[PDB]
Write a protein that binds this ligand. Structure first.
Ligand SMILES: Nc1ncnc2c1ncn2[C@@H]1O[C@H](COP(=O)(O)OP(=O)(O)O)[C@@H](O)[C@H]1O
Ligand SMILES: Nc1ncnc2c1ncn2[C@@H]1O[C@H](COP(=O)(O)OP(=O)(O)O)[C@@H](O)[C@H]1O
Lengths: 746, 493
């Protein structure tokens, strides 16, 4: 609704000093011809200069020299706030000096060769930060701000004095611009970047609103995650997008000094952060400054921790200075930092997923030409344990594989450096395969909290089970008020029990896929590692990962493992209690019904499990997963076979009726064996064909009609003889006896 | 401030301390406050620097000198009494100790009132529910919650319109109100509860909540109410009141509820320690923690101490008979050592509970330790009706039900066995309501009727249908053989 809130669009006058008009809008403005109009955009950088060299284009979209997009803006669709401020003072003059492309060739004076013919009767109505193109030649070189005799911008005049003593530089300014791009330079942390925005934008952008009222903003943010996850980059991207000053402090440069100087170095940053407010102070690898008392041995190492704490509390008066720190885990630092007023907030950056990895690949390979057969969707699927930098390395390594393999001797002496070889060259899929398979040792071994991809259709039958799951997990999230109305408290646990390989691990993922919630999976070997290592504290950490990622689902399987280890089913003299389930119960009981955290347990030996875990407020509800029926068997056959060429004379309906009691595991083994037979036959045929005509005196014979394009009935018939049942009737008798003895077993 | 002293050198630190003491003396009557005392004076085992030990002695000398001069008083704040040196806890330096503990529902509500004064609220606040749902939070947490809830609404509106309308003024600034939905969002999303340790407070359960059991109520009031109310009567005669009681019986009969009903009747603090804590102490070989518990009770008098799953340790090692070892362990010995060395005047009562008295060590049943035993039997018909009414006094229900018919239809049941039936019936009703509502909303959306509202709550209350359906799964829990064993133990005495 703001009248001067209008889009900006393409421009044709290669001189940036021109700014457009819109006669219907000029009638709204007081736009006069002369020196300057203040056209205001983002980040406070403007393009202020002479005006009215337009009205060639339509209205509602001001024509502004495209070079004032990288500056003052980012892209199209933006909006300008054009308001005249002509008649600026006439100081001495504005700086003259190039930046990047002038040292390349004759330099002379850098003013009187190429730039002099442009400050003619248009004597630079400008604003420091306006960047453009001006030359007396190839017509592509920048003109940047270096000096400022008058603080506000002016209109130059002859007879002045200029010193091109300055030297053209690198893209310090371009790096600053890349940082300014910010949100469009990262991927895989969509949630974590939205939480920060809503947390810091309001204090920084409109501090007056917070001044007018008494409310408490944040003064400490802590980001913990594995290395190489783009944390300092996030801080720079957030500081630049809001225009707030950014100061960087690193740990090693504070612990590599002498005592007094080291302490005093930490007080200059705060002093050079309050005189540039609103500003941000960023400290990385805080673990190198303030670790726990276990790793803090020495007196001077404590004089530097108390100094930091007393400095943090000196900001309660000032609400426009914010501190963000980075580390790996939160328990690696003194808890005194984690307090109310020092580092209250927390953020888990985490690890990207297929979508985030694909986004990172896209950004990293933007200028990297890729000819063909580069999907980048597959690549994101085989990268399990890669973070940030690693992918970048990948993108470089493959590129090297492109040139190192064949350009090894071509580029030695035949030619000098040229672009027709660099641009003409491309990157293929084989380079990516060699780079990923050969020299990519992932640096990750931690747990993963992300939504899976398994859908309901992958599982067969069990409609009642799915209905029950929806009633338990899905209903409360949508109708909390209905649950409250009847004075009800929903359950927070469920236990699966049944024979092995009947489809219990898939349900925990399908439910999360439908609910759009993260899931965490824990195996029995981890529980045995805790039992033998006698480290039950890790359990707390596990639950901590189920509290900061809500809503989510927590899955425990092979729960009987510990009860199996010590003696048989009954075990040794000792009862059914141990030192690892006690902690699980303790953590379960000390948890609120809110936060939407669900827990699922799986096992195949219900009898041995501690009866104290099925009390109310614990895994109260029990579900019996049975062996699939013939109709379910054909469903599982279709599910497994859908992702292979398996058109055949035989029919899966024929196979299912022959099977009797086959578990789901057996039905994912027939296909594997049949495909193995088919691929062996194909390989043998290929080798014999490739060998015969060349070993024979036949120079050239061509025939490639695929001998094995699909899985035929013969392969399935051969495979059917190599597979049988993998369970005994006695187990089914035990399961049904337990399913009935629950009658009055409470 | 502790760190401000540790962030300097010896001369500067031990000059500021002295100067502060002189300044406090000059402006008498004055007060000195110290925080983060652990950062200054922890136990010597954790101190290595010679300067660190040279900064504690100065404080001791100043504290000793204070007694001679002026009216200055000194107050210090610490996280736990044991975290600091024991030389400060003497006669003349820090003789007096105090605990702050944690606020209760009333305290949380009061803090919300304090922090909501100048803020504008709607009619949907109902801070009582928030206080009930606010478990573990403290004052800072509540202030943060209030600020976050305000910022939710403020950021929603501000980001939407008035960035361009006009320079924000007081009228629009204060025009905005707050709604309970923002509170619920701030509570569910931001829930960094900073409390996971023990708790001490007066419970809310009352005798009316319990079903029947009048004789045990009479037998309980005599043990607790009479000594506190009438000591001179005991003094006139020669008896000294006992300080322990043990409940033995089958599970699901309300043993846990009596220990809190007594406290609610007498308005006394209550503490409950569960069996998992005992097993955690056993495996960790940490019997010292026990002592701390009693100290808390000693400082929370009048109070009641509760222990359940007391037979858990004996069950763990071997079965009822156990392994080769006897009936003793590492924790019960400490409990006896603490009980024997306790004064009667502190009026700290002790309650234990179990369902397998056969394997409890007899040493705890000796005179002076849990000498009075009470048996909690299975609820009867007249009791069962009361339990049903008590559990159903919170939910809306129809009138076709025949509660007495259900009560008589049940035999050998437990209190929980009826609460589970009520929960199952409520689940059936909620599922029916959800299905009906979703089907209704889905059917007419295809029919483009702008106005079609036959709004009737499909099933406000439940009938005999759901209760009889749940009766199919409603079945006995405790075996008759177990009841016979309990009776045999109750007769062989
Ligand atoms: N209903 C089913 N649909 C599809 N696959 C199944 C089904 N039941 C079992 N499976 C197969 O069994 C494997 C998973 O076994 P799982 O059920 O986790 O064993 P357990 O029950 O011992 O945990 C999967 O590879 C899957 O192919
Ligand atoms: N006499 C009773 N009056 C009210 N509720 C009861 C009664 N007996 C059992 N309950 C129900 O049982 C549940 C708690 O059982 P509890 O008495 O704690 O087990 P135990 O007796 O094994 O310690 C409560 O939800 C309570 O409503």
């Amino acid at each position: 609704n703001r009248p001067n809130r209008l889009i900006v669009d393409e421009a044709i006058n290669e001189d940036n000093s021109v700014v457009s008009l819109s006669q219907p809008k000029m009638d709204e403005l007081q736009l006069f011809r002369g020196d300057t109009v203040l056209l205001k955009g983002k980040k406070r950088r403007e393009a202020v200069c002479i005006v009215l060299s337009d009205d060639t284009c339509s209205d509602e979209k001001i024509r502004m020299n495209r070079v004032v997009r990288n500056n003052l803006r980012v892209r199209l669709g933006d909006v300008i706030s054009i308001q005249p401020c002509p008649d600026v003072k006439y100081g001495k003059r504005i700086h003259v000096l190039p930046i990047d492309d002038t040292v390349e060739g004759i330099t002379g004076n850098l003013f009187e060769v190429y730039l002099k013919p442009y400050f003619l009767e248009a004597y630079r109505p400008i604003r420091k930060g306006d960047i453009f193109l001006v030359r007396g030649g190839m017509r592509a070189v920048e003109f940047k701000v270096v000096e400022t005799d008058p603080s506000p911008y002016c209109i130059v005049a002859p007879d002045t004095v200029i010193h091109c003593e300055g030297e053209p530089i690198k893209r310090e300014d371009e790096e600053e611009s890349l940082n300014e791009v910010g949100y469009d330079d990262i991927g895989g942390c969509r949630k974590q970047l939205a939480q920060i925005k809503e947390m810091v934008e309001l204090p920084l952008r409109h501090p007056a609103l917070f001044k007018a009222i008494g409310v408490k903003p944040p003064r400490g943010i802590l980001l913990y995650g594995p290395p190489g996850t783009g944390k300092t980059l996030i801080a720079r991207a957030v500081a630049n997008e809001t225009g707030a000053f950014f100061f960087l402090i690193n740990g090693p440069e504070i612990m590599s000094k002498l005592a007094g100087e080291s302490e005093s170095n930490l007080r200059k940053a705060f002093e050079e952060a309050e005189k540039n407010a609103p500003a941000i102070i960023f400290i990385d690898e805080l673990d190198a400054i303030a670790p726990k008392r276990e790793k803090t041995h020495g007196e001077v190492e404590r004089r530097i921790v108390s100094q930091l704490l007393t400095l943090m509390d000196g900001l309660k008066q000032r609400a426009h200075v914010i501190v963000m720190a980075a580390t790996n885990r939160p328990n690696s630092i003194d808890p005194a930092l984690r307090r109310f007023g020092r580092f209250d907030r927390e953020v888990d950056i985490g690890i990207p997923d297929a979508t985030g990895r694909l986004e990172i690949l896209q950004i990293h390979t933007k200028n990297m030409k890729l000819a063909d057969d580069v999907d980048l969707e597959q690549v994101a699927n085989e990268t399990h344990g890669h973070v940030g930098a690693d992918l970048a390395a990948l993108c470089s390594e493959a590129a090297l594989q492109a040139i190192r393999k064949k350009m090894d001797l071509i580029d030695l002496e035949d030619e000098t450096i040229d672009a027709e070889v660099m641009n003409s060259l491309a990157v293929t899929m084989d380079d990516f395969r060699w780079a990923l398979s050969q020299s990519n040792p992932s640096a990750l071994r931690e747990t993963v909290v992300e939504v899976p991809q398994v859908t309901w259709e992958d599982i067969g039958g069990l409609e009642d089970v799915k209905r029950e799951l929806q009633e338990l997990v899905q209903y409360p999230v949508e109708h909390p008020d209905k649950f409250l109305k009847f004075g009800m408290t929903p359950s927070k646990g469920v236990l699966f029990y049944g024979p092995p390989g009947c489809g219990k691990t898939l349900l925990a993922k399908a439910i999360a896929n439908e609910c759009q919630a993260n899931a965490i999976s824990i195996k029995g070997p981890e529980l045995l590692t805790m039992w033998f290592g006698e480290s039950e504290a890790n359990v707390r950490e596990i639950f901590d990962k189920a509290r900061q990622a809500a809503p989510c689902v927590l899955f425990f399987d092979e729960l009987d493992s510990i009860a199996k280890a010590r003696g048989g089913n009954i075990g040794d003299g000792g009862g059914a209690a141990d030192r690892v389930i006690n902690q699980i119960l303790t953590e379960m009981d000390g948890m609120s019904t809110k936060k939407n955290v669900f827990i699922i347990g799986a096992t195949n030996r219900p009898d041995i499990i501690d009866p104290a875990i099925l009390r109310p407020g614990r895994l109260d509800q029990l579900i019996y997963i049975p062996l699939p029926d013939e109709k379910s068997r054909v469903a599982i056959l279709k599910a497994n076979l859908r992702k292979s060429p398996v058109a055949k004379d035989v029919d899966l309906e024929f196979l299912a009726k022959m099977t009797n009691g086959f578990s789901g595991a057996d039905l994912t083994e027939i296909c594997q064996r049949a495909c193995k037979l088919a691929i062996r036959e194909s390989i043998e045929s290929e080798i014999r064909r490739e060998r015969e005509r060349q070993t024979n005196p036949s120079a050239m014979e061509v025939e490639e009609d695929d001998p094995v394009p699909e899985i035929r009935r013969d392969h399935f018939e051969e495979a059917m003889r190599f597979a049988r049942r993998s369970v005994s009737d006695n187990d089914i008798r035990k399961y049904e006896m337990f399913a009935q003895t629950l009658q009055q077993s409470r």
